[PDB]
Amino acid sequence: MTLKVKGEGLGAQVTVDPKNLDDITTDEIRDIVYTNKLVVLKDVHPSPREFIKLGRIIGQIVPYYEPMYHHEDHPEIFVSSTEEGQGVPKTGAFWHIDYMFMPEPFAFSMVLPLAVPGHDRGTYFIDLARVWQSLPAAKRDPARGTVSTHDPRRHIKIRPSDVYRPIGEVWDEINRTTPPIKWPTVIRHPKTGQEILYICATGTTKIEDKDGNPVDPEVLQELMAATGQLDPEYQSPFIHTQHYQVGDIILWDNRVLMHRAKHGTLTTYRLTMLDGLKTPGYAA
């Protein structure tokens, strides 16, 4: 009602002012994200506090479990920056879905770039619903009704507090804190009803059937090949590029898109929200 959408689909432009508790309703902005999957909230130059207000409208904000990622003044904000003492450098250099490995993966991720060097820095996205669409049934039907294991443990980053600890003690703590997790390999989006190939080049280790039996490991390899996630040059037709622009908030559906960083001083703030629907989705 209050927001105007230019375009349709990945990258649609939305024309949001820091006084948003007014006409911006939660159902308005959700239906926009569900519909287009990735949108840009144009030229919002919000303050940290206003960002959070926008996040809370979108849904229930979840702070990142690991506090070295937290903004100095707000636990809610996950900070990626090249600048010493501001969050963590070089986050997300690998395909992933946010909190794909936690008990409640997010419904929405939102990124505000506060400082970008140049015009070629941003994020790659892959539509896992489209990837699924292009799959012939002969490759498709072995994935249905199977269970995928997602293992984050090797990607947990060493923290400043970890220096001089024996690596085995750090690993042991990781293993207690974020063990591998299982999700259905194919899920059905609780809102749109689309079927989603919920697998990740970096994190998905193996597929098993509904009785524990190991699926032919070339199935996982073949599905992963068809997502485009293994193309080291990033030319797959399934790969959308979204370039960062300062003050342009990138907001997207974290069930249906897989993403990774594309690549001066870079600094971005991030908020992640739940939507109260089945996460990541129903088994398909």
Ligand X SMILES: CCCCCCC[C@H](CC(=O)O)NCC(=O)O
* Binder of ligand X out of 74, 121, 155, 278 (CB under 6 A): 155
CA distance 259 to 127: 9
Binding-site partner at residue 100 among its own copies, Fe ion, ligand X, none, CB < 5 to 8 Å by type = ligand X
Within a 13 Å sphere around the CA of 257, how many CA atoms are in the beta-carbon half? 29
Question: Nearest Cα to 60, choosing from 270, 252, 255, 274?
Answer: 274
Q: Mark 100-118 as b/e (b = at least 16 C-beta within 10 Å).
A: bbbeebbbbbbbbbbebee
Binding-site partner at residue 200 among ligand X, Fe ion, its own copies, none, CB < 5 to 8 Å by type = ligand X
For ligand X, the closer of residues 183 and 238 by Cβ is 183
101 binds ligand X (CB under 6 A): yes
CA distance 32 to 27: 9
For ligand X, the closer of residues 36 and 254 by Cβ is 254
CA distances to 109, 111, 142, 253, 278 from 69, in Å: 15, 14, 39, 22, 26
Binding mask 120-139 for its own copies (x = CB under 8 A): ----------xx-xx-xxx-
96 binds ligand X (CB under 6 A): yes
For its own copies, the closer of residues 244 and 266 by Cβ is 244
Contacts of 202 (CB under 8 A, 6+ apart): 94, 95, 96, 155
CA distances to 40, 71, 97, 108, 267 from 32, in Å: 11, 28, 20, 12, 26
For Fe ion, the closer of residues 50 and 98 by Cβ is 98
Binding region for ligand X (CB under 6 A) out of 38-46, 133-141, 150-158, 217-225: 150-158
Taking the chain, what is the end-to-end CA distance rounded to the nearest angstrom? 34
Q: Considering only residues 62-121, where is the footprint of Fe ion by CB under 5 A?
A: 92, 98
202 binds ligand X (CB under 6 A): yes
The backbone torsions φ and ψ at residue 52, rounded to the nearest 5 degrees and listed phi first, read: -65, -45
229 binds ligand X (CB under 6 A): no
* Binder of ligand X out of 16, 112, 116, 200 (CB under 6 A): 200
Q: Considering only residues 56-95, where is the footprint of its own copies by CB under 8 A?
A: 62-63, 65, 67, 75
Burial of 171 (0-12, 13-18, 19+ CB in 10 A): middle
Question: Nearest Cα to 257, choosing from 33, 60, 58, 64?
Answer: 33
Binding region for ligand X (CB under 6 A) out of 14-22, 88-96, 167-175, 233-241: 88-96
Q: Under the rule (CB under 8 A), what is the footprint of its own copies?
A: 6-9, 11-13, 62-63, 65, 67, 75, 102-104, 130-131, 133-134, 136-138, 149, 172, 176-178, 180, 182, 192-195, 208, 212-213, 237-238, 278-279
Interacting residues with ligand X (CB under 6 A): 88, 91-92, 96, 98-101, 150, 152, 155-157, 200, 202-203
Which positions lie near Fe ion, rule CB under 5 A? 92, 98
